[PDB]
Curated annotation (Swiss-Prot), chain A:
Catalytic activity, reaction form: an [RNA] containing cytidine + H2O = an [RNA]-3'-cytidine-3'-phosphate + a 5'-hydroxy-ribonucleotide-3'-[RNA]; an [RNA] containing uridine + H2O = an [RNA]-3'-uridine-3'-phosphate + a 5'-hydroxy-ribonucleotide-3'-[RNA]
UniProt name for this protein: Ribonuclease pancreatic
Gene Ontology MF terms: lyase activity; nucleic acid binding; ribonuclease A activity; RNA nuclease activity
Subunit structure: Interacts with and forms tight 1:1 complexes with RNH1. Dimerization of two such complexes may occur. Interaction with RNH1 inhibits this protein. Monomer.
Gene (name only): RNASE1
Function of the molecule: Endonuclease that catalyzes the cleavage of RNA on the 3' side of pyrimidine nucleotides. Acts on single-stranded and double-stranded RNA.
EC assignment: 4.6.1.18
Species the sequence originates in: Bos taurus
Binding of substrate, residues: 7, 10, 41-45, 66, 85
Length: 113, 11
């Protein structure tokens, strides 16, 4: 029934690449992680850092989450990420995505495992 | 002990 911790890894963890390969990276990865199976998830981020380093963020800078909760943490350091955003013309089931490689601080909500 | 469960955003 997949834990929320596990769902985070499936959706955002890409530790076997240091950056977005090509233009087709989002295209591939949204499919691969099963994120295009019923609907086209419109926006998603993949972090290219080890799991340990992302897990460590939970012990970094505490900040409010967008929803007003206070269980959000900002990485002290910038991490390698790829933003995936469904294109304007995309439609289920041929999901299309623009891929943007960037270096930025990530902000994640944390909970106990 | 404490793990990420939602991605809030970048920078």
């Amino acid at each position: 029934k997949e834990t929320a911790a596990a769902k985070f890894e499936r959706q955002h963890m890409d530790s076997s690449t240091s950056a977005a390969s090509s233009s087709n990276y989002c295209n591939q990865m949204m499919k691969s992680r099963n994120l295009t199976k019923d609907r086209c998830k419109p926006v998603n981020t993949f972090v290219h850092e080890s799991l340990a380093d992302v897990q460590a963020v939970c012990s970094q800078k505490n900040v409010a989450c967008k929803n007003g909760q206070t269980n959000c943490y900002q990485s002290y350091s910038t991490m390698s990420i790829t933003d995936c955003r469904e294109t304007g013309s995309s439609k289920y089931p041929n999901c299309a995505y623009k891929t943007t490689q960037a270096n930025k601080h990530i902000i994640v909500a944390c909970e106990g495992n | 002990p404490y793990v990420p469960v939602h991605y809030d955003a970048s920078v």
